Amino acid sequence: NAKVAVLGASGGIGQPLSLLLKNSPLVSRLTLYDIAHTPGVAADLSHIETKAAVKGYLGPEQLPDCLKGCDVVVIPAGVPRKPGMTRDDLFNTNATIVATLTAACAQHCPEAMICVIANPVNSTIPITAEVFKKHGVYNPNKIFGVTTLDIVRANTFVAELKGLDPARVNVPVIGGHAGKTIIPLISQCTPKVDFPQDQLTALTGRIQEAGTEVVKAKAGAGSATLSMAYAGARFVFSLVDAMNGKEGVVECSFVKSQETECTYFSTPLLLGKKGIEKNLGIGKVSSFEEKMISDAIPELKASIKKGEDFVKTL
Amino acid sequence: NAKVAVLGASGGIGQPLSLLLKNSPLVSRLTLYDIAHTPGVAADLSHIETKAAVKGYLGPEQLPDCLKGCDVVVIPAGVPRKPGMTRDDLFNTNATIVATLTAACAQHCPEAMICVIANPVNSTIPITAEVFKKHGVYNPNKIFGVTTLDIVRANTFVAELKGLDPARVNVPVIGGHAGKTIIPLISQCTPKVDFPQDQLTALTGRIQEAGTEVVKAKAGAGSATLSMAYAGARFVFSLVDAMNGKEGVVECSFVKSQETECTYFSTPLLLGKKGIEKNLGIGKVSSFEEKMISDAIPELKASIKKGEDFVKTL
Amino acid sequence: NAKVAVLGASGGIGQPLSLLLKNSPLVSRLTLYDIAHTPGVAADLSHIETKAAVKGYLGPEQLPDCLKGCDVVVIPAGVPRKPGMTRDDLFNTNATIVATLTAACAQHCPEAMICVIANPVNSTIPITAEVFKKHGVYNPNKIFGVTTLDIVRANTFVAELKGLDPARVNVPVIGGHAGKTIIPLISQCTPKVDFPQDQLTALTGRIQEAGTEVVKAKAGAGSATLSMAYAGARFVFSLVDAMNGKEGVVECSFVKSQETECTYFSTPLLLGKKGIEKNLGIGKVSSFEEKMISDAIPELKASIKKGEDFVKTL
Amino acid sequence: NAKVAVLGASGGIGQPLSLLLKNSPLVSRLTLYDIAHTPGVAADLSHIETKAAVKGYLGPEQLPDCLKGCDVVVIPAGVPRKPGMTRDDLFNTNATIVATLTAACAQHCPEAMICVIANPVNSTIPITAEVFKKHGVYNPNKIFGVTTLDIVRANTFVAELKGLDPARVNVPVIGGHAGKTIIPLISQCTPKVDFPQDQLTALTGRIQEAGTEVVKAKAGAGSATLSMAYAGARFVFSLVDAMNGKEGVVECSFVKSQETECTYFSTPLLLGKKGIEKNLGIGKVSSFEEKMISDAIPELKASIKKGEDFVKTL
Ligand SMILES: NC(=O)C1=CN([C@@H]2O[C@H](COP(=O)(O)OP(=O)(O)OC[C@H]3O[C@@H](n4cnc5c(N)ncnc54)[C@H](O)[C@@H]3O)[C@@H](O)[C@H]2O)C=CC1
Ligand SMILES: NC(=O)C1=CN([C@@H]2O[C@H](COP(=O)(O)OP(=O)(O)OC[C@H]3O[C@@H](n4cnc5c(N)ncnc54)[C@H](O)[C@@H]3O)[C@@H](O)[C@H]2O)C=CC1
Ligand SMILES: NC(=O)C1=CN([C@@H]2O[C@H](COP(=O)(O)OP(=O)(O)OC[C@H]3O[C@@H](n4cnc5c(N)ncnc54)[C@H](O)[C@@H]3O)[C@@H](O)[C@H]2O)C=CC1
Ligand SMILES: NC(=O)C1=CN([C@@H]2O[C@H](COP(=O)(O)OP(=O)(O)OC[C@H]3O[C@@H](n4cnc5c(N)ncnc54)[C@H](O)[C@@H]3O)[C@@H](O)[C@H]2O)C=CC1
Ligand SMILES: O=C([O-])CC(=O)C(=O)O
Ligand SMILES: O=C([O-])CC(=O)C(=O)O
Ligand SMILES: O=C([O-])CC(=O)C(=O)O
Ligand SMILES: O=C([O-])CC(=O)C(=O)O
């Protein structure tokens, strides 16, 4: 019974994301927006033999019609990295894109859940929050910075190393979504896994730099797209299941947080009909993980401020 | 336990196709091949938290390693249509691509199911079979021209018209995969549907020009990609199920046929452990449908001969 | 002070062609048309320090404006070959394009010189003509099939073999613009050059399949663009000098001709103030060249007919 | 008789750049280099009827042979801006490229004139200089940051406002190549022009942000390509004319400088057979212009520092 909109639906991420969404019996209405190529993408997906009615929308003039009556909005719209770039080098470009798109959501679907994929998530969620404030519709329980791909990677890597089924592995990942702000809580991993500090340090670095590993392997042809489409769909499915009253649905996401001195932080979250039902916090951690959290906060605060500062200048 | 190869994995069809395969618990190994970009696509997909081991291969030297030990090979490689073009206009381009890649399959995984997506299917399948004949390993029960998207479209359109759930609609589609060679047997639809003639005619034509409809909408950005990924994945899963012993798996597909005077033809096929268990044939059709079959045989024969001739001229 | 229009200006040929035209003191107004990207291209060129004013038009609504008051119109618009394709494979797409564009030329700038680059030239010129006849403004002295790249190539290939300065070389080339219809009259080359038969065969072969050797080297990335931008510019410059009144300006081009039983043919044309001043005809040829002319007529006649018969279906 | 190398020859700038170079009798050998597509660009150009011997090279393995015996090396190789990006957001990506290409130049053609187009120019020239210093072959008279397009834009806008022929206009532009650092000395224009302060500030603004405007106009399709090919060809031509002993050849360019407290700076340059013959200096400037210089200096210093610091990390 759910209506989902994808803003940036024509991109590397947008298209496979929209495919996974079209395939799902959770979605009953799928609206697709972009500045380019949307009608062709929409006609393509509309042929798939599932119940979701698909409709494409092109240009800022048609953005309002797209957002009308939306339960959930996902935002891959944005520019991806090239080899060498940091996530921060994309800031100027993506800030503008996010501000414009979130404003429309604020005006035309303020009760919707907003899932921002565009980078850097550490700054673009603050932008989304303030933009919603500036239109007087802010609800911190419905704005999500999608960090799911970090969890998905953590699970895959730990599964590979221990020879486990990655469907049975669950690694909480907290903090933010860039470099050393990504903190894998291997001590909270289910099932429990024992590593020497040797491997545990590499495993942590592997998770932190996984996004850059992929950018290097694509040699200028973009960043993670297919895996991100999987993670983005997974998060939307969790969210939509929770909104149908499924119980015990937990996902980590970058949101408005009380858990630290940082006003935005990613922790595991109990999702429900409200959006965020309850924030489960950092919980019990190892010294090594405590350390990483302390180091990450400086950088996190800078990125949050940078986002709030940008909204002031509109 | 299925080991699947995708040849043309970096393209518009191949990337999302590879994603759907990677997500499936039916696939235990996913080997990807292309002449460009493959290692980035594999890196990206390798991070998804499912059991299938992903491996990328690039260039002719690496093709035999992609194909070794494979149960199924999907071949979406090939040049897509631009607006105005027929599928036949791609022939000279794609004939060489398909001949080369099928020669490699015949050499390195002769016992695999070979699923050709590359257009024009009405000609590229005959090419595939003649290549396997020159290598002395032609098994006509394992070579499939993937027509599944024509069935997926038919199901969607019928359901849209009658207000049904498309998951519950099943339209056999026969003949070939180009214009008037696409023959949707609406009279054999489950559930039985009755349409006034004017609606039945418009529906039948819409199914036939569905691909051309998507090319127009995309305005030179290519042909159907996301829905073709859906259709090819569906077909591969059907094949794998049947290989795992599942009973009553029926899919339409353009194969070696003696149902009409055409050497190749698409009809419903019961699949089993060794590919085609039984060609279920045309069955009983309406006169309208009888007329489209008569009208399609000339074009089909020409396209078959065209393909056979290409392998002759070598 | 010639007013030139480039239809298809955002393309691989269209862009560098537009650069060469912008760079010329002959051009006072450069109007650029395409269905995509034309505003960015126009803005780009408008920064160049030449006097030509640049204006960019987008989509068929703005096509009339683009052609208003034009003296010469260049049509590189169309779709390029991929490896393996013949020029004939592009017929369906490009015939529709040329017919649509030349229809507006005929409506909005009937007096202008019309230079068609879009392949297959052997068919697209007849189309242009039959479209102009249909609007009752056909002037056979103003419609040119741009065969210049053949000449340019021939000059270069002769000069590499005789170690000559290609600037001083002039080989006339007659017939059409596809495979065996391209007839390089080496016997009429200035300066005079003597080759044994085997070298004369291989040289002529090289000239005929040069387009295809470039399509192979580009390996999917399209056909000749830069050298066709050069050849196109040269012809437009030649044409314009004559319109200003320069005496003795001769360029080979594929036009309505009565030299052979083929109703369209390429020969050296003396250009003047009203288009073609005088068709200079074949002239003196060798035995080898008479063999090639006679062998070529059947293929030209067919391509001429395909083009003519296409306009009837409109 | 000059032997020019183009690194990044397959790009949007590189291809038209390479064309203009091939069209000049000043060039005897044009070696083209890229990581992709160069063979097909080379073949395309090799057909043009001018004397330049064209040769394609592909991948870091062939780079050394591209550079042997070269007189001028031009480096447009790099990533262009998207809308909203500053030239400096490209630093991390383009620094690595420039450092690697210039490293090869230092080993294989240390005596050649090095013309860097890659952005951000304010930092890439320092990178080149320091890479050349590491290999003990630094000559500050031979390393140029192509600011030429800034001058070409200044000429054009001034010529539009005063109804002049832009070919008879020269505005010196000084400082650097990014935002406020671009300082067009309108007071030193020839022929003399004077604008009211309100028109003068707007003109100055238009020149400073001209590159960003073309990016805006292209809506994500890249940055200025054709005009940059013009500006870069112009510069190489000036540099080759002077190398042949021509006199009175003056071009602005960002080079090693002591005209200000900036260690690198752009001012008009007298060019001769050793490269830089004489720095002509800033000259007499208005209050408005002197103020812009003062404001600019801290930004240039930072950009220069950024580049130097990068090479210390290798
Ligand atoms: N949070 C995460 O885990 C990850 C985030 N990303 C981010 O996702 C973003 C998108 O990545 P890709 O899809 O690969 O890039 P892409 O370049 O392939 O596509 C971007 C899409 O955004 C669209 N777009 C740009 N401006 C728009 C606007 N104003 N309105 C609507 N659409 C607009 C473009 O038309 C294009 O279709 C990037 O910023 C990337 O950094 C990527 C991977 C993971
Ligand atoms: N049977 C059907 O129902 C349908 C068939 N198609 C066909 O699928 C083919 C691919 O379409 P798209 O993926 O959209 O095109 P695309 O251009 O996006 O991708 C083509 C892929 O084939 C690869 N390729 C080209 N030559 C190759 C070679 N020699 N060896 C290995 N790979 C090679 C390219 O590198 C690229 O990865 C086309 O022929 C298209 O007409 C498309 C839709 C439906
Ligand atoms: N006669 C000759 O010697 C040569 C002819 N050609 C031909 O030139 C044509 C174009 O080649 P490229 O520029 O390389 O192709 P391209 O694909 O790079 O660009 C073609 C341009 O035409 C435009 N276009 C497509 N449909 C249009 C329409 N309906 N109305 C207006 N514009 C439209 C496209 O948007 C694009 O800007 C091809 O047919 C190619 O075969 C190429 C080389 C030599
Ligand atoms: N100084 C100026 O006035 C201007 C500078 N630019 C700069 O020019 C540069 C190139 O721009 P475009 O050609 O339009 O972009 P593009 O993407 O069209 O060109 C990229 C080219 O660089 C090549 N490349 C990338 N890495 C390479 C490497 N490691 N080795 C060899 N080639 C490599 C690519 O293969 C491609 O051929 C950009 O940095 C852009 O910001 C653009 C306009 C004006
Ligand atoms: O690295 C990028 O640009 C995209 C990203 O966040 C990831 O892949 O995790
Ligand atoms: O039309 C194309 O090129 C692809 C195709 O076969 C379809 O969409 O049915
Ligand atoms: O091959 C093509 O499409 C373009 C052509 O006619 C040539 O390059 O001579
Ligand atoms: O803006 C860019 O990226 C290229 C540039 O420097 C210009 O056009 O002046």
Coordinates of C-alpha atoms in Angstrom, one line a residue, chain D residues 4-249:
Chain D
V4 CA 53.6 18.4 -30.5
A5 CA 52.4 15.9 -28.0
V6 CA 48.8 16.0 -26.6
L7 CA 48.2 14.1 -23.3
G8 CA 44.5 13.6 -22.7
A9 CA 43.8 13.7 -26.5
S10 CA 40.6 11.7 -26.4
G11 CA 38.8 14.1 -24.1
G12 CA 36.3 16.9 -24.9
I13 CA 39.1 19.4 -25.1
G14 CA 41.8 17.0 -26.5
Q15 CA 40.0 15.9 -29.7
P16 CA 39.1 19.4 -31.1
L17 CA 42.5 20.6 -29.8
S18 CA 44.3 17.8 -31.7
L19 CA 42.2 18.7 -34.8
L20 CA 43.3 22.4 -34.8
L21 CA 46.9 21.3 -34.4
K22 CA 46.6 18.8 -37.3
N23 CA 45.2 21.6 -39.4
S24 CA 48.3 23.7 -39.0
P25 CA 51.5 23.5 -41.2
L26 CA 53.4 24.6 -38.1
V27 CA 53.1 20.9 -36.8
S28 CA 55.2 18.2 -38.4
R29 CA 54.4 15.4 -35.9
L30 CA 51.4 15.1 -33.6
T31 CA 51.7 12.3 -31.1
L32 CA 48.4 11.8 -29.2
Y33 CA 48.1 10.1 -25.8
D34 CA 45.3 8.9 -23.5
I35 CA 44.2 6.0 -21.3
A36 CA 41.4 5.2 -23.7
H37 CA 40.3 5.7 -27.4
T38 CA 43.5 7.3 -28.8
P39 CA 43.9 4.8 -31.7
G40 CA 40.6 5.8 -33.2
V41 CA 41.2 9.5 -32.8
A42 CA 44.6 9.1 -34.4
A43 CA 43.2 7.2 -37.4
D44 CA 40.4 9.8 -37.8
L45 CA 43.0 12.6 -37.9
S46 CA 45.6 10.7 -40.0
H47 CA 43.2 11.1 -43.0
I48 CA 43.4 15.0 -43.0
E49 CA 45.3 16.4 -46.0
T50 CA 48.0 18.3 -44.0
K51 CA 51.6 17.4 -43.4
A52 CA 51.5 16.4 -39.7
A53 CA 52.4 12.8 -39.0
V54 CA 49.7 11.6 -36.5
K55 CA 50.4 8.7 -34.1
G56 CA 48.2 7.2 -31.3
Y57 CA 49.5 5.9 -27.9
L58 CA 47.5 4.2 -25.2
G59 CA 48.2 3.5 -21.5
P60 CA 51.2 4.4 -19.3
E61 CA 53.3 1.7 -21.1
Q62 CA 53.2 3.6 -24.4
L63 CA 53.6 7.1 -22.8
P64 CA 57.4 7.2 -23.1
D65 CA 57.4 6.6 -26.9
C66 CA 54.7 9.3 -27.3
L67 CA 57.0 11.8 -25.7
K68 CA 60.4 11.0 -27.4
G69 CA 61.8 14.0 -29.4
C70 CA 58.8 16.3 -28.6
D71 CA 59.1 20.1 -28.7
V72 CA 55.8 21.0 -27.2
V73 CA 53.7 18.9 -24.8
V74 CA 50.1 20.0 -24.1
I75 CA 48.2 18.5 -21.2
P76 CA 44.4 18.8 -21.1
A77 CA 44.3 15.4 -19.4
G78 CA 42.0 15.8 -16.3
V79 CA 38.5 15.8 -14.9
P80 CA 36.2 18.7 -15.7
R81 CA 33.8 20.5 -13.4
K82 CA 30.1 19.7 -12.8
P83 CA 27.7 22.6 -12.0
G84 CA 28.4 23.9 -8.5
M85 CA 31.9 22.6 -8.3
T86 CA 34.8 25.0 -8.0
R87 CA 38.0 24.4 -10.0
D88 CA 39.7 23.5 -6.6
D89 CA 37.2 20.6 -5.9
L90 CA 39.1 18.9 -8.7
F91 CA 42.5 19.2 -7.1
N92 CA 42.8 15.8 -5.5
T93 CA 41.9 13.9 -8.7
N94 CA 43.8 16.1 -11.2
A95 CA 46.9 16.6 -9.0
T96 CA 47.8 12.9 -9.4
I97 CA 47.2 12.9 -13.1
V98 CA 49.4 16.0 -13.7
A99 CA 52.2 14.7 -11.4
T100 CA 52.4 11.4 -13.3
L101 CA 52.3 12.9 -16.8
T102 CA 54.8 15.6 -16.0
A103 CA 57.0 13.0 -14.3
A104 CA 57.2 11.2 -17.7
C105 CA 57.8 14.5 -19.5
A106 CA 60.8 15.2 -17.2
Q107 CA 62.4 11.8 -18.0
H108 CA 61.5 11.5 -21.7
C109 CA 61.4 15.1 -23.0
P110 CA 62.9 17.4 -20.4
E111 CA 63.7 20.1 -22.9
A112 CA 60.2 20.5 -24.3
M113 CA 57.7 23.3 -23.7
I114 CA 55.2 22.1 -21.1
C115 CA 51.7 23.6 -21.4
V116 CA 49.3 22.5 -18.7
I117 CA 45.6 23.0 -19.3
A118 CA 44.4 20.7 -16.5
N119 CA 42.6 22.4 -13.6
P120 CA 43.1 24.0 -11.2
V121 CA 45.9 25.7 -13.1
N122 CA 46.9 27.8 -10.0
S123 CA 48.0 24.5 -8.4
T124 CA 49.0 22.3 -11.4
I125 CA 51.8 24.5 -12.6
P126 CA 53.4 24.4 -9.2
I127 CA 53.0 20.6 -9.3
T128 CA 54.8 20.4 -12.7
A129 CA 57.6 22.7 -11.6
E130 CA 58.3 20.6 -8.5
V131 CA 58.1 17.3 -10.3
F132 CA 60.6 18.7 -12.8
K133 CA 62.8 19.8 -9.9
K134 CA 62.8 16.3 -8.4
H135 CA 64.3 14.9 -11.7
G136 CA 66.9 17.8 -11.9
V137 CA 65.6 19.3 -15.2
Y138 CA 63.5 22.2 -14.1
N139 CA 63.6 25.1 -16.6
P140 CA 61.1 27.9 -15.6
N141 CA 61.2 29.4 -19.1
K142 CA 59.5 26.2 -20.5
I143 CA 56.5 25.6 -18.2
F144 CA 53.3 27.4 -19.0
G145 CA 49.8 27.4 -17.4
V146 CA 47.4 28.1 -20.3
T147 CA 45.3 31.1 -19.2
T148 CA 44.7 32.0 -22.8
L149 CA 41.0 31.4 -22.8
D150 CA 40.5 34.2 -20.2
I151 CA 42.1 36.6 -22.7
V152 CA 40.0 35.2 -25.6
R153 CA 36.8 35.8 -23.5
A154 CA 38.0 39.3 -22.5
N155 CA 38.5 40.1 -26.2
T156 CA 35.1 38.8 -27.2
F157 CA 33.0 40.5 -24.5
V158 CA 34.8 43.9 -24.9
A159 CA 34.3 43.6 -28.7
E160 CA 30.6 42.8 -28.3
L161 CA 30.0 45.9 -26.1
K162 CA 31.9 48.3 -28.3
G163 CA 30.7 46.9 -31.6
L164 CA 34.3 46.1 -32.6
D165 CA 35.8 43.2 -34.6
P166 CA 37.1 40.9 -31.8
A167 CA 40.1 39.9 -34.0
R168 CA 41.3 43.5 -33.5
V169 CA 41.1 43.6 -29.7
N170 CA 43.6 42.5 -27.1
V171 CA 42.9 42.7 -23.4
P172 CA 45.8 41.6 -21.2
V173 CA 44.6 39.3 -18.3
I174 CA 46.8 38.7 -15.3
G175 CA 47.0 36.9 -11.9
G176 CA 45.8 33.3 -12.2
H177 CA 43.0 31.1 -13.5
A178 CA 40.3 30.9 -10.8
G179 CA 37.5 33.3 -9.8
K180 CA 38.9 36.6 -8.3
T181 CA 42.5 35.8 -9.4
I182 CA 41.5 36.4 -13.1
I183 CA 42.2 40.1 -13.5
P184 CA 41.5 41.6 -16.9
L185 CA 43.5 44.8 -17.4
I186 CA 40.8 46.7 -19.3
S187 CA 42.9 49.9 -18.9
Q188 CA 45.7 48.3 -21.0
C189 CA 43.2 47.2 -23.7
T190 CA 44.0 48.0 -27.4
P191 CA 42.2 49.9 -28.9
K192 CA 41.6 52.0 -25.9
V193 CA 38.2 51.7 -24.3
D194 CA 36.5 53.2 -21.2
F195 CA 33.4 52.0 -19.4
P196 CA 31.6 53.6 -16.6
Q197 CA 32.5 51.8 -13.3
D198 CA 29.1 50.0 -13.2
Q199 CA 29.6 48.5 -16.7
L200 CA 33.3 47.9 -15.9
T201 CA 32.6 45.8 -12.8
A202 CA 30.0 43.7 -14.6
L203 CA 32.4 43.1 -17.5
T204 CA 35.1 42.1 -15.0
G205 CA 32.6 39.8 -13.2
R206 CA 31.5 38.2 -16.5
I207 CA 35.1 37.4 -17.5
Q208 CA 36.0 36.0 -14.0
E209 CA 33.0 33.6 -13.9
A210 CA 32.8 32.8 -17.6
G211 CA 34.0 29.2 -17.2
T212 CA 31.3 28.6 -14.6
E213 CA 28.7 30.0 -17.0
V214 CA 29.5 27.5 -19.7
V215 CA 29.4 24.7 -17.1
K216 CA 25.9 26.0 -16.1
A217 CA 24.8 26.1 -19.7
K218 CA 26.0 22.5 -20.2
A219 CA 23.9 21.1 -17.3
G220 CA 26.4 18.4 -16.3
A221 CA 27.7 17.7 -19.8
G222 CA 31.1 19.1 -18.8
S223 CA 33.0 22.3 -19.1
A224 CA 34.2 24.5 -22.0
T225 CA 35.7 22.3 -24.7
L226 CA 35.6 24.0 -28.1
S227 CA 36.7 27.5 -27.0
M228 CA 39.4 25.8 -24.9
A229 CA 40.6 23.9 -28.0
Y230 CA 40.7 27.3 -29.7
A231 CA 42.5 29.1 -26.9
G232 CA 45.0 26.2 -26.4
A233 CA 45.8 25.9 -30.1
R234 CA 46.3 29.7 -30.3
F235 CA 48.8 29.4 -27.5
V236 CA 50.7 26.4 -28.9
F237 CA 50.8 28.3 -32.3
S238 CA 52.3 31.4 -30.7
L239 CA 54.8 29.3 -28.8
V240 CA 55.8 27.4 -32.0
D241 CA 56.0 30.7 -34.0
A242 CA 58.4 32.1 -31.4
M243 CA 60.4 28.8 -31.4
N244 CA 60.9 29.4 -35.2
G245 CA 62.4 32.8 -34.4
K246 CA 59.3 34.9 -35.0
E247 CA 59.3 38.3 -33.2
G248 CA 56.7 40.3 -31.3
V249 CA 54.9 37.2 -30.1

